[model samples]
Target: TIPHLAIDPFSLDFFDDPYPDQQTLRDAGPVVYLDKWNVYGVARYAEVHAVLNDPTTFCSSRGVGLSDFKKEKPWRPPSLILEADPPAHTRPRAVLSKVLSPATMKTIRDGFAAAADAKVDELLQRGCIDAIADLAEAYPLSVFPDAMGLKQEGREHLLPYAGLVFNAFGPPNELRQTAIERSAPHQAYVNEQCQRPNLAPGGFGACIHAFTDTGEITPDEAPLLVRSLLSAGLDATVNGIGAAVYCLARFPGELQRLRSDPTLARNAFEEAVRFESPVQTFFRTTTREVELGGAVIGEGEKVLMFLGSANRDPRRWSDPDLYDITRKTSGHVGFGSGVHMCVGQLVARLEGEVMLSALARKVAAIDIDGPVKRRFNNTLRGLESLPVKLTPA
Candidate 1:
């Protein structure tokens, strides 16, 4: 039988803490019908993974949110890669795959590392600081835009623009409405920056544009692809780094483990991703009447997959609540799965590995200076501020 849960997940209360409700959703059944949204939610690892991997049955083209494209119009143009199914998705994915490949990560690694080191030096000089402002947001903001060849003038819109996009992925809640209302200027700036003329000749944006010459993607589609990168890349990594730093402070033993072996930094970042799951929930539309967890869902219905909940599912992980950097985080859906797996993952991991490695090598301990603040978004999980003092190694 399909369980019913009267949950308002978009409310500020749910955003403050979701684990308890996430547990309830998982415990209720493999697929629970949410009373508030009239949509089905899959919080358990198995069901969530199954939904993401079988995209043909559970598709993304219908807007990856509560809005079913077949029913409601998208507030903005859908992402060429994120919102389209195969065939429509094929060319854009191909262009981004090549643009954000491992080679691209290698190309950006040294520069990102240098930036990380200098950032750690500055943070250490300050002694006590907001980890989010000083390290997480500051570091990526310093490097990623430069990597993408964006002009320095309008860079302030980047985070606000990212905020609107992610919030828009949820329902038409007050949070979503507020973001949409406040983000007009930010949106315009991002759209303008996505243009080929605004991008430098050799950055990722330019590289994505280059595919037009080879017809991998059309000229019209290239800017949207660049927009996808701008939307998908920034806030996720910023939250991810914030999650890692917050984890290190909360569990000092893990920091000791990381400090003992800097090589563990990559897995440390991955573990943090699984633990916090920055990009928490994404919706998939059932392409046809499909049986999920013994319950048949009609076509055009939204299926919410809780990546954060899936990451912490007790069935899939041992001591799931405990944060351990030594554990293998290979199967985590934190960066998503299947063909739609984050195209920016290589770039995200590169940024994470370098930042964590820099911290592990240069800092002895991470201590929480005061209270931690959470940044509440309908679709993403992250800290607004983390008062911390980094002990020198």
Candidate 2:
């Protein structure tokens, strides 16, 4: 007899806080079937890693979104790099990675850090500030727009567009619908800016266009690739930085540790990613019959790899729930694992470290003024607003 491992997909309990449900699933077994959604879920750290690394066996071509790309309609064409498997995925991945490499990232680090410091200093002068608006959202929106070579007029569209696009990856519910409604008005401008001729020189968008000029990627593929970067890049990092600040304020001693040794900013950022994963869950399709955690998954079936849950799986992590900045967290799947691991992660990390270090250098203490609000989206774990009182050192 086959073992039954089914969970409801639409349960308020599942969405309210998935960590507990994730614990239940991990404790249940490795490959549990969610009968309501007809998908397998890999809840443990080991199992999630296996599924992510083995994209050949668990193909990404069917689409990373919950809707099977092979059959259902995709919101936009699947992300050129994110949704494609190896061979096809390799060149585009190389092209984008080469342009956004660590050395290139280092070039922007100091300036970006200085900008973050300036923003925080401004907030400090204000006495009372909404960290999300003044610090988190303010920094990235300012930097990334210029980095993308986009004009100032329509720059405001990036976050809402990205939010809607990321949410569309999950079930077509109210969250997804709301995003679509919000973005519909700006869709024309967003599409227009994606063109090669429109891209500003010396930005990531220009570099992508150069790739097209050199025949590395086609002219047609160029815009979509840039779109991928824009869609994934904007809001997520801003939300992540805010979450990190919240964690430091809520937890004891972590902020001081960061303040004393500024270099620990990197570790603190990774700890934040592990503690509160920004890109919460993504879908994978099984390429063939495979057994996971002593259970079988059928070919062409969908499975959700809960990275947020895997990051805190008690079976794999000791005291997994605790947020420790000094922990050895290099192998954590917060940025993901395997072929499709985030290509721009180094860029995102640099941004996080710089911003956090800048904030640490200026602020001695951050006290929560009121409750933190969560921004609900199907795919991203983001904060809507966080009210905090910052005390400068």
Candidate 3:
């Protein structure tokens, strides 16, 4: 018999405050089959890490969600990279990783850093602002779209489209349904922006499109890949920036530590990710029979890796709940791990570092000014509203 539990992980109560449910999942067993959703769940750090590292056996070509492409037709064109297995996922991954490599990031850093500075300066003048709306979502929207060389006409569509992409990784429940309804326009617009002539010359979108000229990726494939990267990026980074602000506000001492040593800004963003994981859950289907934490998950099983839970698992870190800026968070799977780890993380780090660094240099203090509100998604955790006031240094 499989270790099992009856709980709706996607329910509003669970999404509102997931820590308790996460704890329950980990406490139940390493691998729990939720009778409700009929999915295998992994909440422990070690178990989650192993599953992520061994994607070959877990397999992605079948699709990363509860819907296996073998049985049900995909809701949309499957991701060439995200939805493909090794040999097929290889070339696209190489192309994208090369495009977003650290060396390539160097070219974009100055521009992002400048954007962060200007945005922070403009926000400080207003004194009080919604960190999520005004800072988190705003900063990324300001530069990233143009960075993609996307037209300003439909830039607002990026976040909604991204929400759909990530949310679709779960069961086709109301959340996924609502996302699809709200996101069709956004999705269509993103598809439109991926066209070659519409892309800005030498912009990241143009760069991804450039692969078409080399016959590396087809002209049709190039636009979809551009859509993939864009969808992966905006929503996740906006929330990451929001998470950093949320963490610092809750932990003023850690905030002060960051202010005193501005160099620690990157650590603050990292610790924030660990403490308040943005991408909460992703599913990987087992390729064959596998043992995880003393339980057997059979072939083609959908294993829901609770990335947020693993990031906070006590077995992985000492005093895990405490948000300490000084802690070495290198091994945290907040970005996932191994081959299928988030391809956009290097870019996320660049976005995080620039945003936090600017705040550290120019802002003296960050304080919550009003009630905080949560934005719930099936796959992502984020703030809808976080009213805050900042003091200038």
Candidate 4:
């Protein structure tokens, strides 16, 4: 008998502009029944955060998608970490945590920084460019895949594959259908690239495979773990960088703040993540009947966590709507929380920090030159085109 809302959060209309519905869902109460999807909804920060942190009570092994793994077969093999709960999720996560450790970030920093500067130099000469296509998507696609030891020939398949991966998390709608219709070659390419023979010696994929020698993960799982990296890696970071650039263009004052102190690039990127919340939603299945927000939920029910809404909940953040580059964005659920927090977060941050730092140093002003375009996804938020004119510093 909790608040029963009939909202299709996956609908294109909701994706085009979600803030209104996000507010309604948040204000509806912490745990509402989404009659459209017939699943539970947790939109407020406290409830969503609590639900994510209490992974044992609200498990992930049943599939993070709306489709229950126990009731339906996954489109592909389940992720050993993303789709697996504790004990099973432990060793794979341990290996990945090491593969992408802070030390690894330092090793990649010089190369990433050089790439950022070179990319920024090109943008500076162009003067006018599509921020999303030219910068956001272009930057990560250039560096990240190479870091993973992927071949240059088939790198075009990464974005399409990512589109399929994230869309699969929602209901079987047109987006999911369309993604599937075109995902065959992309899927095939990803599977091929995940192989040990295809991977270069000194890359993240090889590091993950190295764990098999220590018995931390099986050789069979090594490729699957590499697949896991491809699964959640690219699109979210693309959207995150897109979010930051969009924020800067929309709020020139924030750009001014960034220009004054380039070091604020780190804070600017983090605040943009908190402000935009690109990875909008992830579903969690209830392990058992639990009480949340004064409502009782039954076992095996799927609860959709509205990450974007939780990020802007006024109760958790001051001036939740404002894009302040210097804001203290600690504890923001932008990258999520708990054991299931994004394993590749540092990689995303490195890309963001260097790219923004390079831009802040070289570009004097970022102004919207044309109508901005939004890209819709079931579980991600980003711009399709952000036409911007830049002034060289």
Candidate 3: tens digits of C-alpha lDDT, residues 1-393 = 556788888988998988888999998887888998888998989888998899877888888888888888988888988898888787887778877888868888899999999999999999999999999999988878877788789777888888898888878899988877787688789888878899988677788878766656777888888988778889999999999999888888887888899899888899888888899888888889988878877898888889899999998989889999889898888898888788878888888988999999998889999999999888889999999999998
User: Could you give candidate 4's per-residue lDDT for residues 15-94 as a string of tens digits?
Assistant: 99898999899988878999998999999999999999999999999999899999999988899999999989988999
TM-score of every prediction relative to native: 0.99, 0.96, 0.97, 0.99
Return the TM-score for candidate 4, rounded to 2 decimals.
Answer: 0.99
Tens digit per residue, CA lDDT, model 1, 1-393: 899899887888888999999899899999999989999999999999999999899999998988998898888899999999998898889899999888888888899999998999889888899999888899999999988989999998999999899999999999899998998899899999999999997899999888898866889998999999899788999999999999999999999989999999999999999999999999999999999889999988999999999999999999999999999899999999998999889889999999999999999888998888999898999999999998899
lDDT winner: 1
Local accuracy by lDDT, each model: 0.92, 0.81, 0.87, 0.91
Question: What is the overall TM-score of model 1 with all chains considered together?
Answer: 0.99
Residue 112: error of model 3 in Å? 0.8
Which scores better on lDDT, 1 or 3?
A: 1
Model 3's TM-score against the true structure: 0.97
Stretches of candidate 4 off by over 4 Å are none
lDDT of 3 at 93: 79
Candidate 2 error regions (>4 Å): 1-13
